[PDB]
Subunit: 45 residues, 5 copies
């Protein structure tokens, strides 16, 4: 029973998931950077 | 011993793990986003 | 020589590393959710 | 060979995606360490 | 046989990148835990 078809589908699913992770990660970096900047300008510090 | 069956199984396992990593990141990004807003509206700042 | 066994080995190691990432992430989210709860009750804000 | 070409293409794309994820995390750690030291060096605290 | 050589190369590249990610997350969780302990002790809160 040839399993290559199914294996290809798993690999494509991997890239689909990874692309989601990358997009979530780059937005997360923006949120952390905003957080950093807000703290710096925090007079209390 | 055609290892396609075992290979396929590892791939399927990789995706299951990645699905979980993605869901975890989504909730994490949400928590961080909430934190950003809070600090921005911080009186002491 | 046949490179299939080597390939399966790389896949097994990929999943091992992926499983570690999941545990770390799982823990990270908790530390963050904790940080959030603390900031929510910061008397400075 | 059959689907081999497409499989190899998915693997390369996964790699490129990983490269970016890695680059983003290295920046994210830098931002977290800064934020860390900033709060650690906050008069208010 | 087959594009096994090129495919294996991409997987080794994948695992090497992944191992770096685990280590980056390793350090990152530590930093977060440190920030958490720091905010928990902030006298401003
Ligand atoms: C029908 C017998 C032919 C000999 C066996 C051919 C071996 C390849 C079977 C397809 C495996 C999945 C796609 C190739 C990718 C890989 O080498 O891992
Ligand atoms: C052959 C398939 C390989 C699968 C590739 C594994 C991808 C793992 C990606 C891990 C991303 C880590 C998430 C970042 C966490 C954080 O933001 O703190």
């Amino acid at each position: 029973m040839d399993l290559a078809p199914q294996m290809l589908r798993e690999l494509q699913e991997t890239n689909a998931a990874l692309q989601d992770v990358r997009e979530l990660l780059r937005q997360q970096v923006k949120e952390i950077t905003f957080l950093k900047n807000t703290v710096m300008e925090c007079d209390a510090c």
